[PDB]
Amino acid sequence: DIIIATKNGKVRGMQLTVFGGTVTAFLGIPYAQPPLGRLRFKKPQSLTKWSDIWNATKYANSCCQNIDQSFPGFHGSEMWNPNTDLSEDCLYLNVWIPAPKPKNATVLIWIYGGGFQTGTSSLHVYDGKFLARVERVIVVSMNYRVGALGFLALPGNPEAPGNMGLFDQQLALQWVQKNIAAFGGNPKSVTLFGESAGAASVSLHLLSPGSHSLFTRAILQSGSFNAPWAVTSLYEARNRTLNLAKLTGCSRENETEIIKCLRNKDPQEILLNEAFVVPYGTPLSVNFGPTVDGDFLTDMPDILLELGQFKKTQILVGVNKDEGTAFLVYGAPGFSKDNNSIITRKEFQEGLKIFFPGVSEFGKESILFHYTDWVDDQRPENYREALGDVVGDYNFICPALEFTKKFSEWGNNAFFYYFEHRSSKLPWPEWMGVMHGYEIEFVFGLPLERRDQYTKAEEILSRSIVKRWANFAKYGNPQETQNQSTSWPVFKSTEQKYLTLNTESTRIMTKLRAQQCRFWTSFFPKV
C-alpha cells in the first residue's frame, strides 16, 4: 500500500504487475474543482485541500462528448470511444510511477486527440504502465474539456472566454510542477507528447507564454496548430456560439445572459446541438476548437510561428503514411471499409466537395489537376489513393512539415519521422494502409506484451520507438545508441532529412512530399 502526500492531500495508488516487474498507478487524481454549475464554460479553478486519503485506483469520468456511432460493434471505431462514464465532473489526471520508486525520473505528459471534440485518457492504447516499466520514466495523462463545454468562445468574456480545455491541460502541467517530485519525478525534465488534436495542443503550449515554464521538450504525433482544422477563427467562433444559442432558445441580447441561459441546459442538450452549429461541415469538422482568446493565445499562431515567438527547445515531429484514409469512409461517396473502395473520377470530384465545402470551383479543379497526374492511368485505385493523399497531405503531413521547417529555422534541433508500418492487428481494411492514430500503440509499447498477438518484428519496432521517445524526453536526442541502429539526423530547413519507421529497413530520406506540399503550403492558401 503506497500513499503519496500531494500539495492538496494524500492519494492512494495501486500496484500493477508488468513484465515480471511492478508499476505504481495513480488513476483519477483531481487537479481542479469540477467545472459544474456557475463554473461551466469558465476557466478551471484551483482545488481545496482534502484531509482524508483520496483513492486514485480507477480511471475517473471522461468529459462529456458525442460518440462515434458510425460503426457499432466494430473495434476500429469503438476503440476510440470513451470507456468511462461521461460527466462534466471530469478534470482528473493519471500518474504511472516506476517501482522501485524513482529518484529523479523524467516525466512524459500525454495529451489525447479527438479533434478537440472527443477523447479520454483512460483508453487502453494510452496506458502508461509499459513506459514506466520499460524506460523508468513517469507517465502522466489528463482529461480536459472538449467540444462546446471546452472551447465555446465569447472573446473577452470570462463566462465563456474560449480555450478552456487548453487551460485544463495547462492546470494539469501546473499540477505536475507542484507535485511530481513527491512521486519521484523531475519537474525540470517534462516532455509533452500528444497525437492529432493532442499534438496541435502540444504545439500551442509551445506558443503560450503561460505554459513556457511548465515543460522542457515536446513531441507532436500527426498534428500541429497550423493544420487547417486546428484553430477556430473568431468569425466562425462567434457565429457558432450564436447558432448554439438559437438552437437552444438561449438567444439573448446581453451576451453574459446567453451564457447564464446555456448554464441551465442539460449536458446532452448542448451536445446534441453542437453538430448543427456549422451549416456545411466536413468529416474533420472541429465545431468548437482553439481560438485566439488573448489569454492562452495572444495573436494568430501562424504569425507567432513565422516570427519566432515560441518556447526555444527541441521538438520531435512526425506523421503516418496514410493519415488521410480514415476520413474517407465517413462520408466520401463510393467508399466503404467493407470493400476496396475503387472510386471513379466523378466520385473523386464529389469527394473533394465533401472535404473542401466552401472552396471555389477553381480551387477544387486545382486539387484535381495536382493529384491526377498518374504514372499509370490504367490503375483502378488511382482515384481512391489520390483522395486519401489529398486529405492527409492537406490536413496533416504538409502542416507538420511546415511547422517543423519554421520552428527549426530559429535555431533548435528538430527530428522528423515518417511512420509506415501497418499494424498486424489493425481492424480497418488493408487499402486504408498506415492510418491516422495507429502509431500510438507502438509509442506506448503495447506490442512489448507478447500475449497480445503482435508479430515479433512489431515487438522490436515498438521497443526501438519506445527507447527513442524516452531518450528524446530524457536527453533531447531520439537515438537508439546501443543496438546498431540507424542514426536519426536533425531536421534542417535546407536538407530536410527525416527518419522512416518500419519493421524492415529504417532509412534516412529527404524532403517528404515536396511536390505535394508546395501545392498546399504555397499555392492553395490563396484560393
Ligand X SMILES: CC(C)(C)C[NH2+]C[C@@H](O)[C@H](Cc1ccccc1)NC(=O)C(c1ccccc1)c1ccccc1
Ligand Y SMILES: *[C@@H]1O[C@H](CO[C@@H]2O[C@@H](C)[C@@H](O)[C@@H](O)[C@@H]2O)[C@@H](O[C@@H]2O[C@H](CO)[C@@H](O)[C@H](O)[C@H]2NC(C)=O)[C@H](O)[C@H]1NC(C)=O
Ligand Z SMILES: CC(=O)N[C@H]1[C@H]([C@H](O)[C@H](O)CO)O[C@@](O)(C(=O)O)C[C@@H]1O
Ligand U SMILES: *[C@@H]1O[C@H](CO)[C@@H](O)[C@H](O)[C@H]1NC(C)=O
Ligand V SMILES: *[C@@H]1O[C@H](CO[C@@H]2O[C@@H](C)[C@@H](O)[C@@H](O)[C@@H]2O)[C@@H](O)[C@H](O)[C@H]1NC(C)=O
Shortest spacing between CB 108 and ligand U, in angstroms:
17
Contacts of ligand Y in 334-393 (CB under 6 A): 334, 336, 338-342
From 196, 201, 208, 222, active-site residue = 196
Residue 392 known to bind ligand: no
Shortest spacing between CB 507 and ligand Y, in angstroms:
29
User: 50 or 276: whose CB is closer to ligand V?
Assistant: 50
Residues 6+ apart with CB under 8 A from 469: 108, 131, 193, 219, 316, 443, 478
55 binds, options ligand V, ligand Y, ligand U, none, Cβ within 5 to 8 A by partner type: ligand V
Let me know if 201 is a catalytic residue. Answer: no
| Residue 289 binds ligand X, judged by CB under 6 A | no
Let me know if 323 is a catalytic residue. Answer: yes
User: 127 or 274: whose CB is closer to ligand Y?
Assistant: 274
User: 417 or 472: whose CB is closer to ligand Y?
Assistant: 472
Site string for ligand X, 66-85 (x = CB under 6 A): --x-----------x-----
Contacts of ligand Y in 426-455 (CB under 6 A): none
**Which cell numbers in the block locate residue 97?**
510511477
Beta bridge partners of 93: 29, 142
Residue 294 known to bind ligand: no
343, 383 contact by CB (below 8 A): yes
Binding site for ligand Z (CB under 6 A): 337-338, 427-429
Please select the residue that binds ligand X; options are 243, 251, 285, 313, rule is CB under 6 A: 285
Is the bond preceding residue 100 a cis peptide, omega within 30 degrees? Answer: yes
| Residue 388 binds ligand X, judged by CB under 6 A | no
* Count, residues near ligand Y per rule CB under 6 A: 21
**Which cell numbers in the block locate residue 172?**
494539469
| Residue 284 binds ligand X, judged by CB under 6 A | yes
CB atoms near residue 171 (< 10 Å): 21
| Residue 115 binds ligand X, judged by CB under 6 A | yes
CB atoms near residue 37 (< 10 Å): 10
Please select the residue that binds ligand Y; options are 84, 186, 224, 413, rule is CB under 6 A: 186
Which H/E stretch holds residue 243?
A: helix 234-247
Please select the residue that binds ligand Y; options are 120, 121, 189, 291, rule is CB under 6 A: 189
Cα–Cα distances (Å) from 391 to 71, 229, 283, 372, in that order, read 21, 11, 11, 14
Amino acid 63 reads: C
User: 48 or 254: whose CB is closer to ligand U?
Assistant: 254
User: 482 or 505: whose CB is closer to ligand U?
Assistant: 482
Residue 114 known to bind ligand: yes
Length of the chain: 527
Eight-state DSSP code of residue 395? I
464 binds, options ligand Y, ligand U, ligand Z, none, Cβ within 5 to 8 A by partner type: ligand U
Binding site for ligand U (CB under 6 A): 254, 256-257, 463-464, 467, 480, 482-483
Calpha distance 475→467 (Å, rounded): 11
Calpha distance 187→16 (Å, rounded): 24
End-to-end CA distance of the chain: 62
Shortest spacing between CB 346 and ligand X, in angstroms:
23
Shortest spacing between CB 69 and ligand Y, in angstroms:
17
Eight-state DSSP code of residue 409? T
| Residue 377 binds ligand V, judged by CB under 6 A | no
| Residue 55 binds ligand V, judged by CB under 6 A | yes
In sequence order, what E strands does 241-305 have?
A: none
- Beta strands 21-30 and 92-99 are antiparallel
User: 110 or 438: whose CB is closer to ligand Z?
Assistant: 438
429 binds, options ligand V, ligand Z, ligand Y, none, Cβ within 5 to 8 A by partner type: ligand Z
Judged by DSSP in three states, 153 sits in coil
From 323, 385, 402, 459, active-site residue = 323
Spatial CA neighbour of 234 closest among 112, 151, 173, 357: 151
Let me know if 436 is a catalytic residue. Answer: yes
Residue 436 known to bind ligand: yes
In sequence order, what E strands does 180-244 have?
A: 185-195, 217-221
Is the bond preceding residue 525 a cis peptide, omega within 30 degrees? Answer: no
Residues 6+ apart with CB under 8 A from 28: 56, 57, 58, 59, 60, 92, 94
Beta bridge partners of 108: 139, 191
333 binds, options ligand Y, ligand U, ligand Z, none, Cβ within 5 to 8 A by partner type: ligand Y
- Residue ranges binding ligand V (CB under 6 A): 1, 55
Binding residues for tacrine: 80, 436
Write out the catalytic residue numbers: 196, 323, 436
